[PDB]
Paper text:
[name] exists in all Archaea, except Crenarchaea, and is a replicative polymerase responsible for initiating DNA synthesis at both leading and lagging strands5678. It is composed of a large catalytic subunit (DP2) and a smaller subunit with 3′–5′ proofreading exonuclease activity ([name])5. To help resolve the uncertainty concerning the evolutionary origins of D-family DNAP, we determined the crystal structures of two large fragments of both [name] and DP2 subunits of the [name] [name]. While the interaction between the two subunits is essential for the full activity of PolD71413, both [name] and DP2 constructs described here are capable of digesting mispaired 3′–5′ nucleotides and of extending a DNA primer in a templated manner, respectively. Both [name] and DP2 crystal structures were determined individually by experimental phasing and refined at final resolutions of 2.5 and 2.2 Å, respectively.
[name] structure shows an insertion of an oligonucleotide/oligosaccharide binding (OB) domain in the N-terminal region of the large calcineurin-like phosphodiesterase (PDE) domain. The PDE domain contains five conserved phosphodiesterase motifs, which form the nuclease active site. Metal ions are tetrahedrally coordinated by seven conserved residues distributed in several phosphodiesterase motifs (D363, H365, D407, N453, H500, H563 and H565). To gain insight into the catalytic exonuclease mechanism of [name], [name] was co-crystallized together with deoxy-adenosine monophosphate (dAMP) that mimics the 3′-end of the DNA being digested. In contrast to Mre11, the adenine base binds into a narrow groove of the [name] active site, contributed by the β8–α5 loop and α-helix α9 from one side, and the α8–β13 loop and α-helix α7 from the other side. The adenine base mainly binds through hydrophobic interactions with the side chains of Y415, V593, F589 and the alkyl moiety of K536. This observation provides a structural rationale to biochemical assays showing that [name] exonuclease prefers mispaired nucleotides over paired nucleotides24.
Numbering used by the authors: 152 to 163, 174 to 206, 225 to 619
Write the structure that this text describes.
């Protein structure tokens, strides 16, 4: 039985009040000038979705037009004022996508019209056109039939540039720790493993290599589902140790209070959190999430957000779009979220698909478009660790601190709890993975 305070689900044990972890005096932290900036946050800004699709198309059409190979772009509404002798390019939203034994049928829409696009079974760009999600913005080079079909010979994705200038080296080596899906309130939360991680952060390490990493750790990024929430799915009460949203954030803040002062924490919301029930999520609902807003070394970031650390862009998102990829693309699955993450980077959109349990807000501007090329992309949500480099960009899933729940077992989700990516800010790369799973 769920309860509501002003409409929001609030309720239906210890809150880590006693938890005190002090810094190891034996370890001295390397004095590095903290260079950080929130480069992008959601808060820095008839048909309900008309303005959203206009924004999405405009933004991604700009990214496509930056490809030197894309030329002779013509409006879809002008396609039969064009003779069948002229090779043209069209840019538009993938409204529908259907496979025949003879190829792929797309319904592509721009601001001037809609057109049926045919791509033959094995045009060298087929593998990519077969993977593209609907409501993504793409380009097609080909000829118009005058029967009503665009006979494409080339398919283009917004992509990431193959060539980008290398960044100048930093004065000192600095590390960033990536975590997500803590799920405080859940009986499956790896409480001991997380306490051992807080000890590790406070210089309580047993090797010289770990000691030189901990001394240089200045940033901690938390990519959503920081609490397990209330009324997220039917039967959730059977899994909750802390069945109160206020007490969940209070328990979380008591743990996160034990994070060293020399570490700057960047905390973003997820789908279990007390935040907007659609994406993008500006921040957390301050009425419920207040204890984390009061942490001295914490910065509440939006979902999504772009954090510039020492000149390196870290795009932080919860990971709702990974689900869109695994449902729509056969062959791509969890146990490896790295490849689905690459597809989102290539589409330059975090969650293009509409209709899923993925609620996309009918906002005036599309803030889910990856407008600028990041150095690192961090996502959570799927509860499985992975890391893959695509054209100099590091794609990484920060896993979870939650062991397999009753519900996860039923929907066949197998997590990899307590696997922590260690990022070298200079190269914006995962250099090590801390494994605290022995404590699960
Ligand atoms: N209803 C449902 N069916 C199937 N798969 C699901 C469902 N809800 C979540 N998930 C998956 C998505 C992630 O891989 C994992 C953790 O999501 P999180 O929501 O953070 O617990 O569970
Ligand atoms: Ca030793
Ligand atoms: Ca059973
Ligand atoms: Fe989660
Ligand atoms: Zn989630």
């Amino acid at each position: 039985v769920v309860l509501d305070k002003y409409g929001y689900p609030i309720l239906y044990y210890s809150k880590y009040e006693d938890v005190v972890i002090e810094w190891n005096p034996s370890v001295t932290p390397v004095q590095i000038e903290k260079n950080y900036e929130v480069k992008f946050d959601v808060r820095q800004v008839v048909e309900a979705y008309a303005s959203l699709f206009k924004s999405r198309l405009s933004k991604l059409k700009r990214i496509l037009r930056e490809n030197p190979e894309i030329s002779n772009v013509v409006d879809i509404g002008k396609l039969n004022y064009v003779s069948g002798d002229e090779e043209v390019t069209i840019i538009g939203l993938v409204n529908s996508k259907r496979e025949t034994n003879r190829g792929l049928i797309f319904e592509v829409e721009d601001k001037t019209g809609i057109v049926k696009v045919f791509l033959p079974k094995d045009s060298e760009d087929y593998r990519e056109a077969f993977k593209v999600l609907p409501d993504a913005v793409v380009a097609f080079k080909g000829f118009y039939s005058k029967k009503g079909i665009f006979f494409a010979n080339k398919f283009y994705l917004p992509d990431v540039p193959l060539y980008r200038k290398q960044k100048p080296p930093l004065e000192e080596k600095v590390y960033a720790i990536l975590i997500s899906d803590i799920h405080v309130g859940s009986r499956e939360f790896c409480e001991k493993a997380f306490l051992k991680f807080l000890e590790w952060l406070n210089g309580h390490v047993e090797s010289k290599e770990e000691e030189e990493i901990v001394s240089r750790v200045k940033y901690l990024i938390i990519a959503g589902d920081v609490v397990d929430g209330i009324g997220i799915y039917p039967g959730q009460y059977s899994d909750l140790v802390i069945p109160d949203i206020f007490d969940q954030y209070e328990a979380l803040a008591n743990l996160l209070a034990n994070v060293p002062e020399h570490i700057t924490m960047f905390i973003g919301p997820g789908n279990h959190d007390a935040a907007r029930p659609a994406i993008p999520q500006p921040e957390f609902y301050k009425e419920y999430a207040k204890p984390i807003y009061k942490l001295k070394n914490a910065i509440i970031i939006s979902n999504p957000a772009v954090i510039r650390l020492h000149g390196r862009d870290f795009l932080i998102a919860h990971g709702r779009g990974i689900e869109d990829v695994v449902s729509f693309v056969p062959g791509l699955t969890h146990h490896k979220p790295g490849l689905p993450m690459v597809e989102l980077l290539k589409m330059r959109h975090l969650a293009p698909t509409f209709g899923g349990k993925v609620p996309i807000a009918p906002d005036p501007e599309d803030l889910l478009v990856i407008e600028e090329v990041p150095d690192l992309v961090q996502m959570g949500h799927v509860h499985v660790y992975d890391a893959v480099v695509y054209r100099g960009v590091q794609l990484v899933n920060s896993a979870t601190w939650q062991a397999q729940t009753e519900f996860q077992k039923m929907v066949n989700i197998v997590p990899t709890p307590a696997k922590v990516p260690v990022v070298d800010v200079e190269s914006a790369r995962v250099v090590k993975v801390l494994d605290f799973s022995g404590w699960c």
